[model samples]
Target: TVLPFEAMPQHPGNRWLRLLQIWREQGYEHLHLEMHQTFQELGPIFRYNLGGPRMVCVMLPEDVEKLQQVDSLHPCRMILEPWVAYRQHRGHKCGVFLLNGPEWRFNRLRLNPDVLSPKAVQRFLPMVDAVARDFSQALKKKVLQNARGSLTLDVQPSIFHYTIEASNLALFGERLGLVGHSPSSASLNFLHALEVMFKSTVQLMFMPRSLSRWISPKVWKEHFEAWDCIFQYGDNCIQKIYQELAFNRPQHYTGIVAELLLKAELSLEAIKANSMELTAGSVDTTAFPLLMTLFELARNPDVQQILRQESLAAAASISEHPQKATTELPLLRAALKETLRLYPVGLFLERVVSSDLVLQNYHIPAGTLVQVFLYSLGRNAALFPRPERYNPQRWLDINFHHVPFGFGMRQCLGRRLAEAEMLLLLHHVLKHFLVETLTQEDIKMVYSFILRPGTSPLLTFRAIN
Candidate 1:
């Protein structure tokens, strides 16, 4: 039933049974974990042979860029399913992101520089360093007990808690003290709310969020209540801070609360809601990618040893100001790049055609939701040239094509902040200790909503000699 593009010729297929058989075989084989793809030359509307109509998907970077020019009538996936990213603004649809025309530009401009500026990030270095250092200290205690400890903390949980506190500290301007108690913290409760929100929020992307929730009442209640609690706590905290700052100023006060409060147009609710979003935005998102990077680094100890030597030298080189050691090292940067290549945090950009667009010699109609499958791009031998082998140095030589964080106006706003957090922590780690990791049998990469290395990445870090 799949049709050829309007002008291009069609390729025939046994529509139904073959598709089912393919799904069954591939699903179990784990050859590719997730896939939804289409050849662009085959036109926009192709009968799935099962799921009615599906649009063409493009894996090429050029094809992906063509999406920005698509017609407005199509109202791309950014709008069609804004909630999939999280939750949508009930009336605005996108609230902030679902925008197009002037409104989209305004919101993007409004938010970008204030929070993401270099000055802003520098101001928050203490905030970020505070969390990362606290996290490191927590780990240091374990390693001190036994560089390999009675046991190393499971890698993913520590990384997850670290990101949650780091992001919250950066965004909220105070550590929630999650790392102080146990593996899971009070922030994890809010995260529980976020998870409860996401399970149903993604479902809303395909249809109206209200209608979707109405259909599933029981799940909806827990989800809604959790979200309400998170937002409510956010607002309550803001009021207490406002009162504190209003009469008496603390020498060290940080949070988006001050900046966001200064702007009159934004409401208290938006500020509080956005604060909760900061935790959800970074914690799990970073944990898995970082854990994956750990696995990649573990698999390449020669590289790790070289990096350790370089870091130790760099730490000594920065004797007057030791933190400069991390900034001066290039291998750390390459290592991070190598890790991202192997385990991209996100795999696709799901887009709805904003206007009439052309992709891979085919004319795509407006209103079709297109997925640019980055997983395929990141793994494709043609693009990365033997993508499987771990090689950070390749980035030093190659004109890399795979984009995991994305690009252009929508390039990650928080990219610098994220880069700083990931790279600095890795650098400090190298500065202080020798990283040793488990053999392949005990190590595995797992996916729980997002991709992360397995729970116990039994790695030991002995302090530098």
Candidate 2:
């Protein structure tokens, strides 16, 4: 007989007690690991309420597939209340990320053509490739400057600059010139603001924003200030394009911002809001993934050499037309998938069920928040044989079992741009330099709104002949 939702095993303890226990245990940073352990104890599906909302956590591929089946045409994910609260408090508009129902569908439909479409890749590829080219050249210059013809340092900071620079170029059709000698003070401030924004978001995400103001006043203040700087930076970029369009319209395809302006489907306010969301969303999300891919490649030199061969073979075609990198370098793409499998940006994929469903023989009511634990799903040995091994070859062979980008319409909007950016950068790195690290030991990962390396590792970049 099928069991009712209430019959499912739940985390033992009252909500307040559980919240207090998690706080004492400093569980926020290791929430993904905690969830993995919980699933081990409670089985495939379990119930829990962590001071914010009641949720069902599932790790098995079948349960995730069932969740995907019930997803509505207009799907709803758990809202980041803090983000919504800030927008409301400031009287700012929300983009597709914050909207729901028909409104979300409307914005998302317009956005997909510009951001996710095949033609859109054609439009943005050159701009993204130029940034990648410049980034690789700059690193090569640094390597050549050294006596040993090798440069060794933490690459995370450089990766950050490259991602933001590439994102800005693709979105705005103008370079911030961030990958050069010295990044501008304005861009530096914006980067700092983004860091603060992400750090504060994790601290405030669970609590009621109203209550958080009193309980965590410092965090609340930092959150707003960081968001303000981010919006200001976005506004400056948009305003420049807006005035240029008015004075002299460009004959050629400019960027996503220009394309949106020309399309005239979304209002100026809507465009600005969505542009800001895209700008803020693009940076660290892609940067950390690129960093992890490098680290993994450095540790597994055999795989690195194989990728280098592929990249070298394809370098001429990629140089001729940047979008060709998407197809020409399959193993590099698989390596990215493998990296995300082990270290996903978001720890879980969440949805509020659109209709009543049955998962693992438990009856799930409509509108219940269900979280598919990506970290656990990725690491489960039953799903991925020898899950701990860093093997890109496995992805070349892969399911619902491998969804770092989530699934369906509600998947990450920046997915295409991020993929192109990472792939092109890796192609350039592989073609130009051999990536190596002194230590092969695994780096600890922590959740701070996104999964990232607990400590930045130094990587050696030696120019390849």
The number of the candidate with the highest lDDT is 2
Measured against the true structure, the TM-scores of the candidates, in listed sequence, are: 0.78, 0.96
Candidate 2, residues 1-465: lDDT per residue as tens digits? 789977999976466654455345433677777778888998989998564455788888898788888877898988888788788988888998888888888899999999989899988988899998898999998899999899999898789889889998899898777896576788789889987887788877766667667867877888899999998998899999999899987889889889999898998888988999999899889999899999999999999999999999998898898888888889998999899989889887888998999989998888889988888888888779999898888877755877888888888889999999999899898898988997888988887778878988889999875
Which candidate gets the maximum TM-score versus the true structure?
Answer: 2
What's each prediction's clash count? 11, 0
- Residue 251 accuracy (lDDT) in model 2: 88
> For candidate 2, what's the RMSD?
1.8
Candidate 1 Cα deviation (angstroms), residue 73 = 15
TM-score of candidate 1 versus the correct structure, residues matched by position: 0.78
